[PDB]
Design a protein around this ligand. Structure first.
Ligand SMILES: *[C@@H]1O[C@H](CO)[C@@H](O[C@@H]2O[C@H](CO)[C@@H](O[C@@H]3O[C@H](CO)[C@@H](O)[C@H](O)[C@H]3NC(C)=O)[C@H](O)[C@H]2NC(C)=O)[C@H](O)[C@H]1NC(C)=O
Ligand SMILES: *[C@@H]1O[C@H](CO)[C@@H](O[C@@H]2O[C@H](CO)[C@@H](O[C@@H]3O[C@H](CO)[C@@H](O)[C@H](O)[C@H]3NC(C)=O)[C@H](O)[C@H]2NC(C)=O)[C@H](O)[C@H]1NC(C)=O
Ligand SMILES: *[C@@H]1O[C@H](CO)[C@@H](O[C@@H]2O[C@H](CO)[C@@H](O[C@@H]3O[C@H](CO)[C@@H](O)[C@H](O)[C@H]3NC(C)=O)[C@H](O)[C@H]2NC(C)=O)[C@H](O)[C@H]1NC(C)=O
Ligand SMILES: *[C@@H]1O[C@H](CO)[C@@H](O[C@@H]2O[C@H](CO)[C@@H](O)[C@H](O)[C@H]2NC(C)=O)[C@H](O)[C@H]1NC(C)=O
Ligand SMILES: *[C@@H]1O[C@H](CO)[C@@H](O[C@@H]2O[C@H](CO)[C@@H](O)[C@H](O)[C@H]2NC(C)=O)[C@H](O)[C@H]1NC(C)=O
Ligand SMILES: *[C@@H]1O[C@H](CO)[C@@H](O[C@@H]2O[C@H](CO)[C@@H](O)[C@H](O)[C@H]2NC(C)=O)[C@H](O)[C@H]1NC(C)=O
Ligand code: NAG
Ligand code: NAG
Ligand code: GLU
Ligand code: ZN
Length: 875
């Protein structure tokens, strides 16, 4: 109550954005958690470079309270008279008004502001918090922090903006049974009591608030040493110690690869990794202390899948990229978030490709980022890569497909156009230029433009300052022209307004008879260009390397189908995936007749590669989804696609054999077989499930998920549900737990799914981090599509209270409505949204799922007969 809230607008603290004339240099931060009380206290002393006459000093603070009237120091050292302090809620500030204004730190002397604060460790996964786990029957505690993007201000009062880089010396007073970790190595350990220890860490390099991290733990460790000679260690619960090995391997390999690739030293003396037993995102790149959700870090070769292996490798690689792109060089403002996330999403594939050679990681970029985000970015409710954000809710919202995947995709296009070698050098120069400072997007262009003298800014701005992407329309084999590709044909292609008018500078690549050529397709070529060997067939956009779609003439498309039916290997696996992906997306947008798209699938009985099958399954999943309740169309589509996978499903079999990609292929191919109703695949699932219920037999790691899902679906009951629920509690491996949750969500029983939904309110059973995962799994259930949707509506106030409107996963949960395809269902959504109109971080997802559902309704109206004719005539 000493620093109370007031609604006083008459000041610069009414501004969302922090003032230009106040900068932090150094933070002296001390915190003392009372672990078994779920509280902490702390003091922060901040050195402040003032630049203008101000009677007010303000900075960010949320939920956590100031307990003592703050103390102000002049550059000379004198005590400053402080009249009041107060909180201004609307922009998450605490403001202190001095008696008088005093002016800039002109000569190495700085102001010093000291504040005492108390906060909570409970009810939350952001800021500074405590969670528990069980070790040899005992409940143990671990405390950690999580800040990105606007949560450092919950932990301690600070200038919570990515460009207010300051240096840190952190100390923690904890009980002696615990160790304390932070960004920097331990400097000194001193006894307060015979019970308490004060751990002081050595001074940091300049860094943003969102990167500040500390933890109090009783974890064991697995150790590695870099080529730099620096200790790289993963902290892990003693019972889980053996599952930390693989992450330790990749950390070494990828750390050593990146340091060399970026031509720059890792800035800190050590690097730590730790998985928090309850953790709100996937992982977080805190300078020197990277925090993980266990599924993304901990891997067991004897129980985890190849899928899991790759996920661990990729997230680790991702988190390591950030130590350069994000940490050393940080975006100036969140609008340029892709400078962090896009770069990490691109370089992750390079890291893991170094570590794991036969994973075809470069090709998998198509499956993971490129083709999925081309779906996202064909909606009106997408946004440009450089995004205007004006609230904390808007800031957190842009941690999405666009920042990550399109970021990754347009770098993938850029690298290829500019050539890998020059892209590398260009990244290096940017990295040394803006080291320990902040960069804008223009700065990265200017850096790469110095590596190629190609018109990088001019070309890359078109991809970056407007949403969407083009479809190239082919006239007469050789003439191309560009148009915006939108999934909704009724949508206005000029909206929302763009200076660039939705035309792009398209780096174009094409293959003529195994020889490859390149052109930049200029915006100002309004009537299109012509592509420079007298030719019959011209393969445009090889390996789908550019962020665009190609619509060949119908004749060409027809010839491609026949070419696939005669010898599909004529195309590279990536090229098959891409052609199939484009055709089905073009058909979805009413730019290509569905008969033409479906014809490309006729060859599939002989398809044996991962990439094409993945993009086939993706396209079919949607079509099958739209006809779930059509008793006439569904069996026909099912019957067909069952026959098209049967050969490869049988050939690969129900057993973990072959290399990484083959094993990934088997998972999704057997899964699709099950999905399409194959009696024999379902029986394998039920048979293995029955065996697993017998309590000894350890399932083949790459088949487990399918066995739990389809086994529970086809032969699950209360006895086996209860058992599966027991198993989920008993296993320590998070990757197994998550599979078992999908199993539990698969039962065809309303009563059991109802028990499952009730468990979501029980924190001893379902972790806070997993609630949205479980809701999503249930929504995939034929019964639970409606149950999950109904439950989030009835329990909306409860979820908002538990997570806050600022939590992006809560915001995104409405996307469980994506398969909706009737006017009735759309009315439900709109009714629910009108009832709870304060959407927070859910604002964009709402817009997106509404757009999707409307498209769905239209799609059914446009294509039901055409698709029916195609299947009926064939069968
Ligand atoms: C983390 O990194 C290690 C290397 O940096 C991996 O390598 C393990 O260690 C052994 C030698 O370093 C390897 O040697 C042997 O390989 C041959 C196979 O032809 C066999 O003699 C043995 O299976 C194996 N030696 C053993 C088991 O003592 C192994 O290939 C290898 N594996 C094991 C279990 O030791 C680690 O595998 C790697 N760990 C993880 C989890 O990824
Ligand atoms: C798990 O799935 C396997 C398929 O991937 C099943 O194996 C197949 O079983 C089929 C029937 O038992 C066989 O198909 C045909 O059987 C009839 C019997 O009357 C024969 O005429 C046909 O010649 C034969 N088809 C062919 C193409 O030869 C399969 O041959 C058989 N094997 C394979 C490799 O496909 C498993 O039975 C199933 N397991 C469980 C426990 O359900
Ligand atoms: C691209 O798709 C085209 C449109 O579907 C294909 O052309 C169709 O082939 C069908 C064969 O599956 C034909 O259906 C047969 O003909 C009549 C339809 O009126 C029926 O009586 C027959 O029962 C049926 N055949 C069987 C075995 O049941 C269609 O006539 C035909 N449709 C049109 C509009 O021409 C192309 O073949 C396909 N191109 C490829 C694969 O390259
Ligand atoms: C952590 O727990 C404390 C108390 O255990 C919560 O504070 C209580 O809030 C409820 C209503 O929201 C009141 O009935 C109590 O009087 C409060 N207690 C105290 C001591 O203030 C606190 O809200 C929890 N923190 C979070 C983030 O949920
Ligand atoms: C779904 O599961 C419920 C819960 O187990 C089943 O209800 C049980 O049915 C058995 C046999 O008919 C009874 O002995 C139990 O008393 C019932 N339990 C409860 C809690 O009601 C139900 O039959 C299943 N529904 C299906 C398979 O459609
Ligand atoms: C499966 O698990 C449930 C939960 O433990 C069992 O317990 C019943 O749960 C319902 C609520 O869903 C309670 O109202 C009943 O009183 C519980 N029964 C008790 C305490 O005996 C359920 O019995 C289990 N079923 C099987 C077949 O194991
Ligand atoms: C960069 O790495 C090199 C080689 O390991 C080393 O000699 C140099 O001191 C490093 N630069 C630093 C720590 O600033
Ligand atoms: C393609 O463009 C060229 C050059 O503008 C022109 O000669 C030709 O007629 C165009 N049309 C077709 C179908 O090739
Ligand atoms: N950069 C993190 C997400 C951080 C967050 O959203 O809290 C990741 O994608 O791994
Ligand atoms: Zn990231």
């Amino acid at each position: 109550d000493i620093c109370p809230a007031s609604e006083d607008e008459s000041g610069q603290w009414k501004n969302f954005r922090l003032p230009d004339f106040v900068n932090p240099v150094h933070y002296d931060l001390h915190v003392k958690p009372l672990l078994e009380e779920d509280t902490y206290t702390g003091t922060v002393s901040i050195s402040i470079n003032l630049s203008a006459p101000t009677r007010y000093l303000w900075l960010h603070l949320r939920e956590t309270r100031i307990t003592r009237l703050p103390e102000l120091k002049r550059p000379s050292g004198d005590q400053v008279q402080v009249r009041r302090c107060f909180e201004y809620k609307k922009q998450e500030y605490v403001v202190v008004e001095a008696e008088e204004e005093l002016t800039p730190s002109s000569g190495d002397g700085l102001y010093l502001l000291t504040m005492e604060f108390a906060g909570w460790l409970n009810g939350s996964l952001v800021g500074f918090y405590r969670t528990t786990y069980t070790e040899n029957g005992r409940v143990k505690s671990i405390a950690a922090t999580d800040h990105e993007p606007t949560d450092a201000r919950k932990s301690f009062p600070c200038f919570d903006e990515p460009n207010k880089k300051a240096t840190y010396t952190i100390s923690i007073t904890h009980p002696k049974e615990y160790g304390a970790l932070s960004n920097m190595p331990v400097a000194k350990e001193e006894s307060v009591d015979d019970k308490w220890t004060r751990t002081t860490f050595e001074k940091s390099v300049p860094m943003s608030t969102y990167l500040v991290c500390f933890a109090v733990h009783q974890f064991d460790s697995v150790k590695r040493i870099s080529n730099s000679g620096k200790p790289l260690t993963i902290y892990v619960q003693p019972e889980q110690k053996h599952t930390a090995e693989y992450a330790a391997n990749i950390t070494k390999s990828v750390f050593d690869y990146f340091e060399e690739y970026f031509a720059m030293n890792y800035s800190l003396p050590k690097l730590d990794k730790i998985a928090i037993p309850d953790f709100g995102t996937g992982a977080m790149e805190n300078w020197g202390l990277i925090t993980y959700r266990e599924t993304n870090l901990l891997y067991d070769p004897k129980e985890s899948a190849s899928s899991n292996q790759q996920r661990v490798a990729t997230v680790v690689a991702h988190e390591l990229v950030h130590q350069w792109f994000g940490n050393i060089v940080t975006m100036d403002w969140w609008e340029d978030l892709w400078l962090n996330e896009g770069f990490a999403s691109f370089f992750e594939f390079l890291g893991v490709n170094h570590a794991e050679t036969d994973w075809q990681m470069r090709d998998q970029m198509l499956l993971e980022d490129v083709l999925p985000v081309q779906e996202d970015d064909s909606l009106m409710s997408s946004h440009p890569i450089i995004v205007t954000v004006t609230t904390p809710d808007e800031i957190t919202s842009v941690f999405d497909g666009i920042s990550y995947s399109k970021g990754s995709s347009i770098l993938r296009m850029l690298e290829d156009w500019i050539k890998p070698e020059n892209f590398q050098k260009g990244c290096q120069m940017y990295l040394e230029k803006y080291q320990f400072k902040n960069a804008k997007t223009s700065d990265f262009w200017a850096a790469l433009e110095e590596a190629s003298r190609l018109p990088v800014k001019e070309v890359m701005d078109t991809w970056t300052r407007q949403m969407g992407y083009p479809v190239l329309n082919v006239n007469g084999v050789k003439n191309i022209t560009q148009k915006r590709f939108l999934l909704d044909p009724r949508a206005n292609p000029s909206q929302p307004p763009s200076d660039l008018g939705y035309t792009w500078n398209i780096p174009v690549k094409w293959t003529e008879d195994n020889i490859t050529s390149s052109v930049l397709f200029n915006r100002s070529e309004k009537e299109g260009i012509t592509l420079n060997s007298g030719n019959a067939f011209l393969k445009i956009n090889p390996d789908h390397i550019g962020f665009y779609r190609v619509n060949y003439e119908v004749a060409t498309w027809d010839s491609i189908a026949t070419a696939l039916s005669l010898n599909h290997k004529t195309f590279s696996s990536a090229d098959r995936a891409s052609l199939i992906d484009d055709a089905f997306a073009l058909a979805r947008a009413q730019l290509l007749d569905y008969k033409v798209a479906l014809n490309l699938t006729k060859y599939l009985k002989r398809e044996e590669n991962f990439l094409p099958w993945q993009r086939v399954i993706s396209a079919v999943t949607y079509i099958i989804s739209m006809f779930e309740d059509d008793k006439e169309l569904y069996p026909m589509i099912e019957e067909y696609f069952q026959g098209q996978v049967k050969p490869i499903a049988d050939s690969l079999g129900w057993n973990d054999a072959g290399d990484h990609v083959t094993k990934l292929l088997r998972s999704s191919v057997l899964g699709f077989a099950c999905k399409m109703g194959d009696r024999e695949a379902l029986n394998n699932a039920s048979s293995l499930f029955e065996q697993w219920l017998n309590g000894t037999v350890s399932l083949p790691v790459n088949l487990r998920l399918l066995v739990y899902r389809y086994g529970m679906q086809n032969s699950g009951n209360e006895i086996s549900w209860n058992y599966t629920l027991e198993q989920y509690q008993k296993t320590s491996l998070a990757q197994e737990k998550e599979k078992l949750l999908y199993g539990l969500a698969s039962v065809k029983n309303v009563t059991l799914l109802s028990r499952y939904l009730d468990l979501l309110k029980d924190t001893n059973l379902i972790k806070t981090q997993d609630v949205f995962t479980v809701i999503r799994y249930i929504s995939y259930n034929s019964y639970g599509k409606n149950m999950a949707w109904n439950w989030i509506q009835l329990n909306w106030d409860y979820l908002v209270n538990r997570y806050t409107l600022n939590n992006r996963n809560l915001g995104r949960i409405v996307t469980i409505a994506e398969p909706f395809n009737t006017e009735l269902q759309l009315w439900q959504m709109e009714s629910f949204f009108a009832k709870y109109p304060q959407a927070g971080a859910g604002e964009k997802p709402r817009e997106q799922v509404l757009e999707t559902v409307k498209n769905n309704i239209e799609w059914l109206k446009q294509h039901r007969n055409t698709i029916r004719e195609w299947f009926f005539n064939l069968l």
